[PDB]
Amino acid sequence: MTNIRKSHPLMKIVNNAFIDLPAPSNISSWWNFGSLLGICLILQILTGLFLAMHYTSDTTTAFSSVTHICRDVNYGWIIRYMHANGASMFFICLYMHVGRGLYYGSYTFLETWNIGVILLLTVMATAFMGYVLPWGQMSFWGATVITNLLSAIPYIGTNLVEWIWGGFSVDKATLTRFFAFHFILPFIIMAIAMVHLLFLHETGSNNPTGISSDVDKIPFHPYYTIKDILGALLLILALMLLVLFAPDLLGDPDNYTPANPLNTPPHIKPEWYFLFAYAILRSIPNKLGGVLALAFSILILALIPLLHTSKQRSMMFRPLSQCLFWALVADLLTLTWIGGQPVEHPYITIGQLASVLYFLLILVLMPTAGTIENKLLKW
Amino acid sequence: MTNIRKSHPLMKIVNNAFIDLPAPSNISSWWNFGSLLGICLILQILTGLFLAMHYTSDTTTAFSSVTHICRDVNYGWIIRYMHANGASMFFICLYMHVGRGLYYGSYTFLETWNIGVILLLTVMATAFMGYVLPWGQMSFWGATVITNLLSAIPYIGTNLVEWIWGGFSVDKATLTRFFAFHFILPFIIMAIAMVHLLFLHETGSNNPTGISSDVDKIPFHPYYTIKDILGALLLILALMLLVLFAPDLLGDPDNYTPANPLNTPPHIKPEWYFLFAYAILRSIPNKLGGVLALAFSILILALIPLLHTSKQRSMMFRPLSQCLFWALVADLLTLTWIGGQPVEHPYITIGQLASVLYFLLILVLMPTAGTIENKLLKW
Amino acid sequence: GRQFGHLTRVRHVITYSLSPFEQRAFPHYFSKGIPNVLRRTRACILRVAPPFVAFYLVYTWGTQEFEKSKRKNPAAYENDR
Amino acid sequence: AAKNVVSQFVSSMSASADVLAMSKIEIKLSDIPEGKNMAFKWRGKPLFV
Amino acid sequence: RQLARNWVPTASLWGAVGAVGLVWATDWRLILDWVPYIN
Amino acid sequence: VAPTLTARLYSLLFRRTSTFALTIVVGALFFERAFDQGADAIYEHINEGKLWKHIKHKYENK
Amino acid sequence: SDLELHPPSYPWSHRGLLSSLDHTSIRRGFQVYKQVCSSCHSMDYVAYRHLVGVCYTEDEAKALAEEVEVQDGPNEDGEMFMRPGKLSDYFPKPYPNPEAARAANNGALPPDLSYIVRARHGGEDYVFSLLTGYCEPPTGVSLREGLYFNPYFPGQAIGMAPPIYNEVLEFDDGTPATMSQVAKDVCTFLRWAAEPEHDHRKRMGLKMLLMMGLLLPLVYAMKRHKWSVLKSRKLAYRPPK
Numbered sequence A, B: 001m002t003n004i005r006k007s008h009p010l011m012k013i014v015n016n017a018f019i020d021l022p023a024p025s026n027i028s029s030w031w032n033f034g035s036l037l038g039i040c041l042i043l044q045i046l047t048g049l050f051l052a053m054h055y056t057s058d059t060t061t062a063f064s065s066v067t068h069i070c071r072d073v074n075y076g077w078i079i080r081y082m083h084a085n086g087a088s089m090f091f092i093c094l095y096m097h098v099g100r101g102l103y104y105g106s107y108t109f110l111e112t113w114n115i116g117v118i119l120l121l122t123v124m125a126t127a128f129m130g131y132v133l134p135w136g137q138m139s140f141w142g143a144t145v146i147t148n149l150l151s152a153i154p155y156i157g158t159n160l161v162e163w164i165w166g167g168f169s170v171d172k173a174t175l176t177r178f179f180a181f182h183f184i185l186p187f188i189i190m191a192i193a194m195v196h197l198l199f200l201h202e203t204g205s206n207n208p209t210g211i212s213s214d215v216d217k218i219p220f221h222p223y224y225t226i227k228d229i230l231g232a233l234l235l236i237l238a239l240m241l242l243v244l245f246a247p248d249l250l251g252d253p254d255n256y257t258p259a260n261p262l263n264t265p266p267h268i269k270p271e272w273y274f275l276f277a278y279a280i281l282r283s284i285p286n287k288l289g290g291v292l293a294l295a296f297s298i299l300i301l302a303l304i305p306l307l308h309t310s311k312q313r314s315m316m317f318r319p320l321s322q323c324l325f326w327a328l329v330a331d332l333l334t335l336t337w338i339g340g341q342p343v344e345h346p347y348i349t350i351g352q353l354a355s356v357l358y359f360l361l362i363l364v365l366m367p368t369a370g371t372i373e374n375k376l377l378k379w
Numbered sequence C: 001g002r003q004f005g006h007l008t009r010v011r012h013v014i015t016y017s018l019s020p021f022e023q024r025a026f027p028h029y030f031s032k033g034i035p036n037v038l039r040r041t042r043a044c045i046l047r048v049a050p051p052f053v054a055f056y057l058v059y060t061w062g063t064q065e066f067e068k069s070k071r072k073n074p075a076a077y078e079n080d081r
Numbered sequence D: 001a002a003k004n005v006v007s008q009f010v011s012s013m014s015a016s017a018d019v020l021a022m023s024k025i026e027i028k029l030s031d032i033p034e035g036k037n038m039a040f041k042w043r044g045k046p047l048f049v
Numbered sequence E: 001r002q003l004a005r006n007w008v009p010t011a012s013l014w015g016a017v018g019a020v021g022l023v024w025a026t027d028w029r030l031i032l033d034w035v036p037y038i039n
Numbered sequence F: 001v002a003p004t005l006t007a008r009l010y011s012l013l014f015r016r017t018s019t020f021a022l023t024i025v026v027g028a029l030f031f032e033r034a035f036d037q038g039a040d041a042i043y044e045h046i047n048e049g050k051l052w053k054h055i056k057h058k059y060e061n062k
Numbered sequence G: 001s002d003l004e005l006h007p008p009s010y011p012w013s014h015r016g017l018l019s020s021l022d023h024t025s026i027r028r029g030f031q032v033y034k035q036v037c038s039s040c041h042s043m044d045y046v047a048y049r050h051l052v053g054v055c056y057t058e059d060e061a062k063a064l065a066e067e068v069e070v071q072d073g074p075n076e077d078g079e080m081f082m083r084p085g086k087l088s089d090y091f092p093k094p095y096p097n098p099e100a101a102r103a104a105n106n107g108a109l110p111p112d113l114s115y116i117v118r119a120r121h122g123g124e125d126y127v128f129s130l131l132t133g134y135c136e137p138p139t140g141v142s143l144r145e146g147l148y149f150n151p152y153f154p155g156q157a158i159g160m161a162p163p164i165y166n167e168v169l170e171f172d173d174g175t176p177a178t179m180s181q182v183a184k185d186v187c188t189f190l191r192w193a194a195e196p197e198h199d200h201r202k203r204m205g206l207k208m209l210l211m212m213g214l215l216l217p218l219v220y221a222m223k224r225h226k227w228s229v230l231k232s233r234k235l236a237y238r239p240p241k
């Protein structure tokens, strides 16, 4: 390393965690969602910032101010639309970034998975709170439902809720909080991210066949750096095309009306990416037991590594283990549309049915599927 | 390293940058200000946070809201007083943390010094903006003076100012900005800090005699960890004793009156730690040339390493090089009280005198002092 | 590389020490100490005090010279003419 | 594609379109003739004119 | 020595690289129109 | 034979990395000046009489 | 569970991708507001700043403004003023207060019309056919006096008396005033108030595409260029074995 400029400030040797990080040869495009999360994250914080400079947190002000942006501020309309739609284009990435996780059995990495779980669990909190900030009608009641739901806890419930509200209801001081949180909190996600990426550098990436790739490696600079850029580009359209021609399409909530606590909207739902979770809840008639499922919905992702039941990592070689997996996809997709429907006996029964199936696939079938095929191949 | 728990998560080997970091044996208490900056920094962000939850940024609201904290919020009065006085106890540390820098000649570390310079230069910006937020009288005019001063630039000046203001004057949108900045910006300081500490781990600390300490080193865990805690404790009193018995002492600005653009206060000054800089300015009659000095005031700290003129690092062994240095202390101390005085002719002349002396010590005398003593000792 | 192994080479340097229990938290703190403070207070004080002294004079002198000028208007020009 | 967007963000901070409408609004064409006239209030301040 | 080699014609251009850059970077005098320049 | 337009071009420009950089700047320079002007007409030609640019002629300067 | 009909999608001069609004019709569309909606439904969120959007030239707008405005102006030298001055004002409200609003409305509450386009479902077509449709009550249904039966409205009982009849007005243009012609001309206006940036944004909508046609192939050109060394590999296993 003679006059290699990579040593001289030390910090650049830390920057050879990228450039020479060896990688597998064969990598499907499905591994591009590594980057496209990050860039969807950065593009927030900036566009997340220049909204803050004109926003104001007050029960009296807030809604007026958001009016004030789209009308009077030069280029003020693009930003608000990049930010909001920049949320949805964030999840649609995020889920895929889990999907690759299972179907190739990347969860075998035991630590990096977990930090994965938390890192999800935080976002769902952030992308919630902000959704209150506009203080519109669907924000007000959609605030009461989610929080007041938490009263289910047997004893400390009644106090613990009133604590967060800072009062009896969702009036001012409940707003001001949810600004100061939704502001800071992404930075922490950025903090964890540079941890969540760390452990990965020890074992390198997995690769589609589920085989130790040792004999075949490639420099990271000339090759995958382009492919991410190419990946980075297709996002923009998918972001622009949506945000530019059809603003309100995925902006499915129709309600800009200033919140009136007296009135109630006939139908009330979160925005789309939440629905299925909220759909789980309606199933259980028993209130307390109902909440647990919703909490237990995601956490099961942490228990999956205990269920690795077979002798080969991938699902690309297991037809059965592949067969079921897709049914789980439609099963979720079902839940989405279910919750987006009124609670009327043709729907009611259905959600109750799809609920059990969901767990039954993950928690029983899939761990069994691997057992048979071991027996088949004579393993 | 058999079953040493320090490997197993990798992140803990990164945490042996503390515990076994070898250190010199003899270390004066003057090296405790390494930590006491950090803790004064953390203690901000928290106490800096729980103010945000009840603060509101509006021309109409803001001042009312700060009223609302000291009156109506349970334990609301301590926090505001910890935060503000937690600023002054931050600088009084910070300067010492530079003072140790010169007098032992630690600046010989060439990179870590520079990152030191920036890391200062940022704080002075933050601890400014926040001081606008209360929107009191001394905040309003103290805002106009500092910013409008920047118009001195020959051509782009007139626009560049109006840009930051977002208008012709300091009305609303000038406030909302300075909240969203003063909120985020400390995190960046925390970002740099973990860089500014990095390079240090390569060369280890210096030690009072200015000698390579190699033969004598000590584990960092059993010994200095206590001493910092002991150091960490004496702060609290010095913070508490001030914030508890005598709130407004160092709170020298007397002005809570809601800002009226029409009226003007008879005397106008920044809070104390700024004054000397602001005192430099009054000296120069010529406006443009005046501003440069103020900018050139600090930056000279970066040029000091070029001036290392002698064959031995410390100033503990150079009586002359020590003799002058103390005069520089009073010289600053002079400037402080000078700016804190009206601009009548007994004062006027003085500041002009102390101004030249200041540079003359740093920029001429001290680099000469080392030359003679080399010649004396027969070097 | 690793910090402690390779630091430097030292030869034939012997060290002795006691448990912290065997010995005391204050081996004649006041008696042996109070002289030690003095002999090391004076070595610096020659080099430290004088500059501050200069300041305080200026400060006092400055105020007086300031005072006479403003406070007494009928000083240089008295009220006759 | 670079220069526009950069120039677009920075075009957010610079100036509102509302405040700009409140700049130099006093058109006059009234007063009170002779030496007394009336008055106004331009950029915040207000005295006599 | 000092032979300043093509580094000089090198640097010379690079200096002219950014000089045009700022003009392109910014606007100001928009610059004597010289192929379209809006009013 | 004479060198194909590229064979010239490569020797004159893209060889020296300075020029290879410089040419890019002036390129985008002229580019935006012509490019943006065309895009308007195409759009504007789509909407006729739907914009004051045409409409304003009915009432402008009375 | 009132059957909610849906507005059948009409063509719209702005319906297409690169389609724009017709400003000419907007002038009419505004004129209606000042005439009729002035009674009850207000718009808080818009100033007189219109100038060239609806084509009103600054002179015209000023005179257009200086009739309308505001009250008072002498409250011990603190307050506002008559005759707005510049365009700075917002639009005068018919009501001081939600209560005084509701009282005259016989318990009904007129909603704000500013963004009401994007508020209600169905887009603007909702409004147009709504104001269009007024039917005769079916046999066997009763209503409250103020309430009028209209199918689109969710409860199908509305306290709004139908505003429109053939030729309620005369137009600045002079085009015949028709219940159909009048109605649409409004339903264009509101569509502009809910997104004043409308006609401006689609420029990029076009202009980014023409930009973007270049890159995607070009970038895709490079990608295969670099990788072309990998996809050209050949292996052979030549053991001394």
Ligand code: HEC
Pocket: G036, G037, G039, G040, G041, G105, G108, G109, G110, G111, G116, G127, G157, G158, G159, G160, G161, G163, G164, G186
């Ligand atoms: C007679 C006074 C009055 C007139 C004039 C008037 N409105 Fe109405 N209108 C009302 C009231 C009051 C309501 C709401 C009553 C209700 O919701 O039961 C209403 C309903 C509406 C609604 C639907 C409100 C909702 O609840 O969804 C719209 C949109 C509307 N008016 C727009 C207009 C338009 C456009 C005009 C001009 C043609 C107009 N108004 C003129 C009184 C009026």
Ligand code: HEM
Pocket: A041, A044, A045, A046, A048, A049, A050, A051, A052, A055, A066, A080, A083, A084, A087, A090, A126, A127, A128, A130, A131, A132, A133, A134, A182, A183, A186
């Ligand atoms: C992962 C990062 C982020 C996510 C997922 C996120 C998500 C959201 C969402 C969903 C909204 C509501 C959208 C809407 O109301 O139209 C929102 C609004 C907002 N966000 Fe964020 N945001 C993020 C980062 C930030 C950052 C870093 C900031 C500040 C620097 C920020 C400031 C705001 C503000 C002020 C609003 C209110 C403006 C508005 O909603 O119109 N956000 N954010």
Ligand code: HEM
Pocket: A031, A033, A034, A035, A037, A038, A097, A098, A101, A106, A107, A109, A112, A113, A115, A116, A117, A119, A120, A193, A196, A197, A200, A204, A205, A206, A207, A301
């Ligand atoms: C903001 C959230 C996230 C960010 C920024 C992020 C970022 C990344 C990046 C950049 C990589 C390296 C590229 C790659 O391996 O694909 C990665 C790997 C990985 N992440 Fe995340 N990810 C996030 C969320 C998650 C979540 C929620 C999970 C699991 C619940 C997860 C699990 C993984 C796994 C298993 C890998 C390695 C897979 C492999 O190497 O084959 N990540 N993540």
Ligand code: HEM
Pocket: B041, B044, B045, B046, B048, B049, B050, B051, B052, B055, B066, B080, B083, B084, B087, B090, B126, B127, B128, B130, B131, B132, B133, B134, B182, B183, B186
């Ligand atoms: C190095 C870190 C910080 C410094 C030097 C600092 C300094 C200051 C100063 C000097 C003030 C004005 C004091 C006063 O008005 O009484 C202030 C106020 C304020 N600071 Fe900070 N602050 C820091 C960190 C933070 C953080 C991290 C936050 C938010 C989480 C924060 C939020 C605020 C707020 C809301 C105010 C207005 C409250 C008030 O001034 O009464 N500050 N800060």
Ligand code: HEM
Pocket: B031, B033, B034, B035, B037, B038, B097, B098, B101, B106, B107, B109, B112, B113, B115, B116, B117, B119, B120, B193, B196, B197, B200, B204, B205, B206, B207, B301
């Ligand atoms: C928020 C600001 C700062 C923080 C958090 C900070 C923190 C630290 C810490 C923890 C150390 C290690 C302990 C020590 O060596 O004393 C250190 C070392 C040092 N810092 Fe900073 N410091 C800050 C500001 C500065 C500034 C402003 C300068 C110079 C302009 C500076 C120059 C140095 C130097 C020279 C050392 C090493 C001295 C030696 O090892 O003998 N620091 N700093």
Ligand code: FES
Pocket: none
């Ligand atoms: S700038 Fe007005 S007094 Fe110094």
